From a paper:
All NPPs share a conserved zinc-binding catalytic domain (phosphodiesterase or PDE domain). NPPs hydrolyze pyrophosphate or phosphodiester bonds. In this extensive study, we determined the crystal structure of [name] from [name] in complex with a phosphate ion and various nucleotide ligands allowing us to characterize the substrate recognition of nucleotide triphosphates, dinucleotides and nucleotide sugars by [name]. Similar to NPP1 and NPP2, the structure of [name] consists of two major domains, which interact via a large interface of 1279 Å2.
Crystals of [name] diffracted to 2.4 Å and contain two monomers in the asymmetric unit, which form a small interaction interface (536 Å2 as calculated by PISA33). The two monomers in the asymmetric unit displayed no significant differences and superimposed with a root-mean-square-deviation (rmsd) of 0.165 Å. In the active site of [name] two Zn2+ ions (referred to as Zn1 and Zn2) are coordinated by D168, T206, D326, H330, D373, H374 and H483, which are strictly conserved in the NPP and alkaline phosphatase enzyme families. Zn1 exhibits a distorted five-fold coordination geometry, whereas Zn2 is coordinated tetrahedrally. In the nuclease-like domain, an EF-hand-like motif comprising residues D752, N754, D756 and D760 coordinates a Ca2+ ion. At the domain interface, a glycan chain at N533 of the PDE domain forms a hydrogen bond with H758 of the nuclease domain, which coordinates the Ca2+ ion of the EF-hand-like motif. Additional glycosylation was clearly identified in the electron density maps at residues N237, N280, N289, N574, N702 and N789. Additionally, a disulfide bridge between C429 and C818 stabilizes the domain arrangement.
Numbering used by the authors: 140 to 146, 151 to 474, 477 to 579, 588 to 652, 658 to 684, 688 to 871
The structure:
Amino acid sequence: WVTEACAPQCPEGFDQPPVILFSMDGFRAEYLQTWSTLLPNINKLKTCGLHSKYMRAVYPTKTFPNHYTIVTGLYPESHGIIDNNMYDVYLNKNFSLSSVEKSNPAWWSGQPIWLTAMYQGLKAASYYWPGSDVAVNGSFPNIYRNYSNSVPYESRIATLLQWLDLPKAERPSFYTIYVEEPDSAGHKSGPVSAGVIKALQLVDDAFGMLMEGLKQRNLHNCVNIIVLADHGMDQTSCDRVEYMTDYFPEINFYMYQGPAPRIRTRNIPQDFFTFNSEEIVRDLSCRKSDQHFKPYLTPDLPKRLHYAKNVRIDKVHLMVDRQWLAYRNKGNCEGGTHGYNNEFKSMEAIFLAHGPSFKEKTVIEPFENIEVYNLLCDLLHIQPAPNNGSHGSLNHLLKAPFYQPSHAEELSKSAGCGFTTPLPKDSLNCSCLAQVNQRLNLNRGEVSATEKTNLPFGRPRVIQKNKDHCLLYHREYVSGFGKAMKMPMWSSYTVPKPGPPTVPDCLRADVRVDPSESQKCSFYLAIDHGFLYPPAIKGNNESQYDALITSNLVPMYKEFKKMWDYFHKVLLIKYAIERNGVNVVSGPIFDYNYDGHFDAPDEITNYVAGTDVPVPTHYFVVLTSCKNKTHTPDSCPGWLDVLPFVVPHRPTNVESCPENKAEDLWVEERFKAHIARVRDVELLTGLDFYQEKTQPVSEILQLKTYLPTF
Ligand SMILES: *[C@@H]1O[C@H](CO)[C@@H](O[C@@H]2O[C@H](CO)[C@@H](O)[C@H](O)[C@H]2NC(C)=O)[C@H](O)[C@H]1NC(C)=O
Ligand SMILES: *[C@@H]1O[C@H](CO)[C@@H](O[C@@H]2O[C@H](CO)[C@@H](O)[C@H](O)[C@H]2NC(C)=O)[C@H](O)[C@H]1NC(C)=O
Ligand SMILES: *[C@@H]1O[C@H](CO)[C@@H](O[C@@H]2O[C@H](CO)[C@@H](O)[C@H](O)[C@H]2NC(C)=O)[C@H](O)[C@H]1NC(C)=O
Ligand SMILES: *[C@@H]1O[C@H](CO)[C@@H](O)[C@H](O)[C@H]1NC(C)=O
Ligand SMILES: *[C@@H]1O[C@H](CO)[C@@H](O)[C@H](O)[C@H]1NC(C)=O
Ligand SMILES: [Ca+2]
Ligand SMILES: [Zn+2]
Ligand SMILES: [Zn+2]
């Protein structure tokens, strides 16, 4: 097989191509980029088949949360396996890989691919995979093996080939095979070591035995084989360890130590909810200038991580820096580990695919492991269970896609807010000491002109039932006003390539918006008002008046407004120069229950004092330009370049530690730490973007799932 050149070529009885999901634990993307030529079997798969630059794992980058994510398409908060070691307060049980509780189905939520195949008339086999030796939803796969880590790889491969030799009626359609290396070697001596080289060659021989076994059965060009990893590997040192004793004079709490720490009470289940979580994060915040970890309350963690909505995820969390560790006390730390931020290059996992359904000799852009489940369903010709993947985003991997995606259906239509009188019925206790409202009255030609410039990819669609809203048109921007919350859901504007300050003490009522559906300036006097669209970004002094209205007002904390004003005055201009103009879509996010979805009116717990106007938990800023920098965002036919942000709307800037530090040293870093996907913004707002962009839905889904890295 290895000496043979590159290639459904299926034999008798094989009507549909079988699927083999091979996992090599801790096989980082870096190993494939550097040591490929040392691994002849994996290098042939890299040359002949399809492979991604890297595959992004889920946070924490651990074995059990990631392996269960690949087979369910769910974030650990949804499937329940948030760590290899965890505690459930309601069950009052401890989960560990050594305990009998690992076999307890009460911990395993969602629907793994082996169950989905069995429920839809197909047989599924498994030679190791977290959850496959567990009766998930009262059922085990057709053929499974109870975990035994030391069984030689040659035996694992031979048993898998015996399953493929079974008669058509007994023979499974889906297979999973798991291997411990190069993770074990990575933990012992680190990612760049001789032990890792030996472990990589060991997994190459194991994969070689499988491919040679398939070659003998003439299934080498029939089977749709996927070779991936759960996470990556990074180097650790005992000199690179942070101790909690250096921050607390007496530790009375329990800590899940390592690269992704969690802090809870010792007295469980009695004091679990009464435990002062905010006191612990406060006592660990900005303690030292060179602190190698960042304490967070789970709702304050970057939203792209999706690591909060589960009782097993303790409120106190620590974001540990690259190559560092966090322990309770000095007491292992040598070699290497994983569990860190999934954005870190060292945590990136491999992804390779070969078969008749996959594209030959293709290098695909990086993607997330939450997307694998829908792809597995497509290969198996089965309907996927509700997951967090975007069905159709991985269609560019398949020769002939099984599923065809479509744009999300708008559940609410725009109505009202038409220009009637240029005089306001209610002043709304607003004042401008400096007829101008005629600029707000746009004709069909003027409306089409602002739609062409400020809405080049079409208006964001409202994917919310009974959401009373209207579209407000201006010469420099277009906004979608949410009537019930008295503020806009989104504000869209295309800043041109640049080559003035905001008008002070001037604010008036919007003549188009009804007084009962608009904010009053007196509401903020009794947290201050902020402008969603920056009034001074486009046009001149007279152009500013179109933005110095009540409909452009959003509730903002004084400390958050410092980051917001700096971003639109300094950072936004810098980005507009770099990408030859930029289309900006900004708006509020309400997620008080921290489920990663837009809040219902009854879910919002904080409002502006004495009023029904809600306080946003986050603010989104989606920057869209074109890949080809010769064209502007408003006039471009090709692929787009996106940079979305989901910045938490917090009363303090404690997350940045900005004491005695100028805004040019911490604002950009804070925005960069809260970068998300367009899909993350879409889930948190109940909006759908780029529906009028002339491109297939599968291609737009790639842009929506894309995560910009720095
Ligand atoms: C995996 O191990 C479990 C035991 O931990 C096996 O489960 C037993 O299966 C027999 C089947 O005759 C039952 O009588 C027992 O009651 C089961 N015990 C438990 C605790 O569930 C299981 O069969 C093993 N799987 C394989 C494929 O070897
Ligand atoms: C789960 O494991 C923890 C230890 O990690 C156990 O916690 C102890 O709980 C008692 C009260 O039940 C406390 O007095 C101890 O201080 C706790 N120890 C630590 C180190 O936290 C817990 O009991 C275990 N629960 C079960 C059901 O096994
Ligand atoms: C990830 O997908 C899961 C499954 O579709 C989502 O979880 C469901 O959320 C709804 C509404 O909160 C619940 O009624 C269901 O019971 C949940 N199902 C499961 C299996 O937990 C989850 O919200 C999605 N996450 C994101 C961020 O979109
Ligand atoms: C659990 O199994 C039942 C059938 O016994 C099925 O209807 C249900 O959808 C399954 N649930 C999940 C989450 O897979
Ligand atoms: C960018 O667009 C110009 C035309 O405006 C074209 O000549 C050029 O080839 C394009 N670049 C790429 C990389 O496609
Ligand atoms: Ca929510
Ligand atoms: Zn692992
Ligand atoms: Zn490991």
